[PDB]
Design a protein around this ligand. Structure first.
Ligand code: CA
Ligand code: CA
Ligand code: CA
Ligand code: CA
Ligand code: CA
Ligand code: CA
Ligand code: CA
Ligand code: CA
Ligand code: CA
Ligand code: CA
Ligand code: CA
Ligand code: CA
Ligand code: CA
Ligand code: CA
Ligand code: CA
Ligand code: CA
Ligand code: CA
Ligand code: CA
Ligand code: CA
Ligand code: CA
Ligand code: CA
Ligand code: CA
Lengths: 160, 160, 160, 160, 160, 160
């Protein structure tokens, strides 16, 4: 099975939007969110990846307890969240911890309760509502097969 | 200068929706919110008040640090959030601590930063989205005079 | 589905062993635990039940986020943990929140992942290791049907 | 050997000064402290005591982990903090948990390390500096025997 | 408008005095404070500056929520805290987040409310009372223009 | 008097088992513990050491307040915990902060309360009980002199 390293930027429950600067590796506070919302899962990116824009592929990791900003978590993808915003398409891979039997029951997007997926969607649809010149036009969920394909595309781009 | 006691049910930052049961006085968990949202201010109700809803008049309190559920805070009103939900009008009186000179610069709704009023509005408009058969329609932020009048109304209703 | 109110005494992750006095209703610190352990679920008792020993029926509640000591939670039973300690038979009903569709997938003890049942068991087996004259000696899980029967017996004992 | 119940109003590390209303038993926020200081121990009062000033006798409880506001702790005195402020006399009994063998090495005021006693002193001397028309002009520690004498006086006054 | 990157060493509310080692970039615990006090704002230093003692120029950042130690925050100066301690002169630039319109109402030292500036002064005046070989002699606030002059000097020294 | 730098990987009270990768210096989540236990002291390793295993020598640090993962603490040894798990044998040096006179009363293993030593032992004996292929076979406390020998040992092997 496919797996990889995710670097968590923002723990679950945070209104502080942290981002890891990729030139340096330093954790930065981008902004305090303008909406009364908090990240529904631990949020970050996959190491040694690169998307269409000059940034790694975004990742969401389900956990029994949050980590801190800058922490690595070995994860495997079970699905992916597509969305369109002010800078076009944005993909977010949904993962669980790799080599952990406690998450073996989650092999695909259908194994994650509809209510956690709706809550995730709702966050990304609404979190920038009060920010000038920022919107989220579309949003929906694809399966693990489509997620793994997107990871494979992003690894290939990185190595090039 | 009008003042009253507010009982805080939900501290700022909470996704657990607590409620005081008014007949018994116990704190209950009503529900964990279905949306990835957190109460932007300390939320509760004014003691010895009564609306058309058989319940007390709801209240928001601006604080430097949150209290915990069940705590009493002496407060004075600076405005009111007017909204309609699935059960009609649900007005919420915005307050600051009474007799505290660090809040003397806040006398009316205009003295509260718009960004904070925006975020409070965004919470109540969106926190119930994912709950079926539930919705909110924000009317407007109204001034201190409109608030004090509603508080006075609901105090008279209580005394009966 | 059968349901009832649970008063939570100890939130998940606490080494402080809080207890409610059943006359006064006050929260008391019985003791700081002598072992490096923490309650793996929110822990308390079912309101208006009378067990075989004069005390109410104990309860464990699975939640997405812990509450505080003294909080009421409407819960439905999915199983029961039977064990013996230094004062004989000790039974603890495992529950989920009642009227919450996010827990509809948990209808009996087999739906609760074994890792969580093993952990709960491990807590109670070991938490009084370092207290003299205190132990727990038997332990095993019984299904929803037996839990509901035990709750019903305890509801009646209380009424009489 | 003397012991009693201490009700904790304020946990260690708190800048919010909570208070129990002794008529109703409700927890109130008196005020957010005006200085950048935090209570160095859990703070509260002794149940069934009445001091010379109409209120219950104040108490500091040394703990391995803090409790929450409103929690009872069975405790025994090991000393007292004698203080004169703007309202005159103010005596606070320093306690440890009763019947807990992890505190049996603490028998009198000399057994509490001087760094802790100085820190506590430093709190009460400076926490109201920035509060107007508020001060403390005398601050001294006394032994268990003197502390126990004051508790006894206060207990007997409670029985009027 | 002048701006720079501040690295936060100590979040607001902390009694642990964290310090970044400027050679390696590692975070160190210098000491647990000897007074019962907590840093009243997020505290750190300005990146790519050089104070005339060989360290980066110290910075205080006003935030709606604290960050973690090591986190970068883009900021702009609004004033400066001038103090004289056991090391002689010690300057600390008071800042707000740069490119954040929620802080546009704070442009110079007079825009910060007095109760917050007094609290910050109170911290630095008193936090080393109980520390041996450490004392304060004086503390004053100066305006944005004085602060900017000091930043600019420290920047040129950095380039040398 | 021997002293060294300890990097804390895991703060006290944690169920998340973090690790520093000694190649990269990145913090990684190894695993969420399968037992309902939490690290009773801050846990990590000694910098510039090499144990029998090929990783650095492990360290426990007694603190008045926990740090966060990746923080350096100057520390001196007062004893050592010897254990035999799967993977050979593991040793953990028990320390206190160096140059801190609040810990001067702790010079050898006899000076640490037995209650704290039993709790630390109890953690490392039981924390992997439910993990397959993991175990403990023996657990002992040894004195300062024994610990200092093992540190110096590990320093030499790092240099060689
Ligand atoms: Ca990302
Ligand atoms: Ca992205
Ligand atoms: Ca985006
Ligand atoms: Ca309410
Ligand atoms: Ca209402
Ligand atoms: Ca409503
Ligand atoms: Ca809805
Ligand atoms: Ca119980
Ligand atoms: Ca029982
Ligand atoms: Ca028992
Ligand atoms: Ca035992
Ligand atoms: Ca008191
Ligand atoms: Ca008093
Ligand atoms: Ca007083
Ligand atoms: Ca004063
Ligand atoms: Ca600094
Ligand atoms: Ca300086
Ligand atoms: Ca200094
Ligand atoms: Ca000093
Ligand atoms: Ca280690
Ligand atoms: Ca090792
Ligand atoms: Ca090992």
């Amino acid at each position: 099975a496919m797996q990889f390293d995710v670097t968590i930027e923002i723990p679950k429950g945070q209104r502080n939007k942290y981002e890891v600067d990729h030139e340096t590796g330093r954790v930065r506070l981008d902004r305090y969110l303008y909406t009364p919302m908090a990240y529904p899962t631990d949020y970050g990116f996959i190491e040694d990846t690169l998307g269409d824009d000059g940034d790694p592929l975004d990742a969401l990791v389900l956990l029994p307890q949050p980590v801190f900003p800058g922490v690595l978590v070995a994860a495997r993808p079970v699905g992916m969240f597509r969305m369109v915003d002010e800078h076009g398409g944005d993909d977010k891979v949904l993962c669980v911890p790799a080599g952990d039997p406690r998450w073996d029951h989650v092999q695909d997007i259908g194994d994650v309760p509809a209510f956690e997926l709706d809550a995730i969607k709702h966050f990304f649809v609404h979190y920038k509502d009060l920010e000038p010149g920022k919107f989220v036009k579309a949003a929906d969920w694809v399966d693990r097969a489509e997620a793994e394909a997107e990871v494979q595309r992003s690894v290939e781009r990185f190595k090039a």
